[PDB]
Design a protein around this ligand. Structure first.
Ligand SMILES: OCc1csc(-c2ccnc3[nH]ccc23)n1
Length: 154
């Protein structure tokens, strides 16, 4: 019982693009760009589509960097998030009614205003490591248990 989601991090040598979600699931937190994968669409195609919808950016090749499964206690469906990175995009980040994008220097990533699990795996992403993670949440703020391991093949 898991649902497929994507997450895209535009990660350049000295900065990363995050977006402040304005409403819905995850509102009020900085994050990468992503969402549900649709019928008849590959995971990577869904990731590329979500980046365009939410940031206005066009990406060619995405690189698989991680998979994180999220459990929210009391909710039946696990969220199976496939995480991708790119350093090459086209277009300018656009603010919309749904999303406010902003570039961050790697030393100033706003972990206090992000999902709490990001503090665990984002540093692996910054050092170009790949990972498999599982996080059990109570509500949206409390990590009850987790696992996180580096891998060679996502
Ligand atoms: O569709 C994207 C999506 C679904 S669930 C989720 C998520 C849940 C909990 N912590 C998180 N940190 C970064 C992303 C994330 N992102």
């Amino acid at each position: 019982a898991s649902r497929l989601y994507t997450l895209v991090l535009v990660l350049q040598p000295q900065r990363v693009l995050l977006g402040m979600k304005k409403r819905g699931f995850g509102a009020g937190r900085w994050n990468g760009f992503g969402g549900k994968v649709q019928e008849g669409e590959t995971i990577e195609d869904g990731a590329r589509r979500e980046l365009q919808e939410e940031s206005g950016l066009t990406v060619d090749a995405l690189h698989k960097v991680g998979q994180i499964v999220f459990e929210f206690v009391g909710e039946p469906e696990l969220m199976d998030v496939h995480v991708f990175c790119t350093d090459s995009i086209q277009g300018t980040p656009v603010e919309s009614d749904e999303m406010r994008p902003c570039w961050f220097q790697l030393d100033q990533i706003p972990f206090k205003d992000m999902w709490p699990d990001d503090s665990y795996w984002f540093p692996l992403l910054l050092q170009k490591k790949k990972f498999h993670g599982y996080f059990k949440f109570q509500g949206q703020d409390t990590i009850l248990d987790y696992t996180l391991r580096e891998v060679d093949t996502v």
